[PDB]
Amino acid sequence: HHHHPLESQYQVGPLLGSGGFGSVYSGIRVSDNLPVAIKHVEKDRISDWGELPNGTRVPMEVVLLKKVSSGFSGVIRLLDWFERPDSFVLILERPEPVQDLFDFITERGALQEELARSFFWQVLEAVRHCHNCGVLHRDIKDENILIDLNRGELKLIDFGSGALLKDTVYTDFDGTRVYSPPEWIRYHRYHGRSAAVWSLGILLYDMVCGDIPFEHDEEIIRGQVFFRQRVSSECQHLIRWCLALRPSDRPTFEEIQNHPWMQDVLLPQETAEIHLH
């Protein structure tokens, strides 16, 4: 299982990590001690720009976060942003305590199906929210999911590879290759929802098997799934449906949520009491 006036209103804490997303720090909003994450993105590493209603030039990541950050959801909310000479600074919600799903799987190995069902359900609700707001994440994977360990609530992070949702073909991609569908590998072409569903099949396999099913382009294109762990027939059926080679053979979000494997989900709080506390 491998990886693939600002200084006034916030007290900066430790660096949490850095990589293609930039540098993320632990912070606290001085006005009310709200835990926050403070994300720095270098201007010359932004390939994707957009504009807000009022029409200032910002990272697409900021456009997409604002579109999804209205109301409650399983998406980490953008509280504020700042422009500096050579960077943007994003202020994000930070649950406490928290663990990314990749780290959680490193520690626990393959998840019990009840727990994978609860997590997968919450991810589907979060992704529906994004699509309903006109946003395609395009990098759904365990590294981009945070677990609120007290509340059993999952949160989607890192909209740095995302785009506005459209009904026409995408011919650009900068998300994670091993979660990218066969139509991307073979043709550099995909549609948003069906590519999202493929990534969800990779994620669900990852949860119940403790690693992703495919490492190489050849395995993605062949689309034969081998189960390395004991997984129920119903769970294998859903995974193999999400991982249909032809995009139009993949389930819709409604078909995933109506699948027999997805019935009788735990509530997040019961999830945390049984599995996390």
Ligand X SMILES: CC(=O)Nc1cccc(Oc2cc([C@@H]3CCCNC3)nc(-c3ccncc3)n2)c1
Binding mask 131-150 for ligand X (x = CB under 6 A): ------------x-------
Confirm whether 139 is a catalytic residue: yes
Stretch that binds ligand X, among 96-104, 182-190, 223-231, 241-249 (CB under 6 A): 96-104
List Cβ<8 Å contacts ≥24 apart for 11-18: 12/38
Q: Distance of CA 111 to CAs 44, 116, 162, 269, Å?
A: 40, 6, 28, 17
Does 102 belong to an annotated binding site? no
Q: Distance of CA 218 to CAs 140, 180, 186, 214, 222, Å?
A: 21, 13, 10, 9, 6
Member of 40, 66, 67, 94 binding ligand X (CB under 6 A): 94
Residue 117, interface with ligand X (CB under 6 A)?
no
* Phi (first) and psi of residue 226, to 5 degrees: -110, 130
**Of the listed 44, 48, 139, 172, which one is catalytic?**
139
Residue 39, interface with ligand X (CB under 6 A)?
yes
Give the torsion sign (CA, 228, 230, 233, 239).
negative
Residue 20: CB atoms within 10 Å: 12
Does 175 belong to an annotated binding site? no
Query: What's the DSSP call for residue 272?
Result: I
Q: How far is the CB of 163 from ligand X (least distance, A)?
A: 17
Residue 105, interface with ligand X (CB under 6 A)?
no
Residue 37, interface with ligand X (CB under 6 A)?
yes
Residues that constitute the known binding site for ATP: 16-24, 39, 93, 100
Instruction: List residues with catalytic annotation.
Output: 139
Contacting positions for ligand X (CB under 6 A): 16-17, 21, 24, 37, 39, 76, 92, 94, 98-100, 143, 157-158
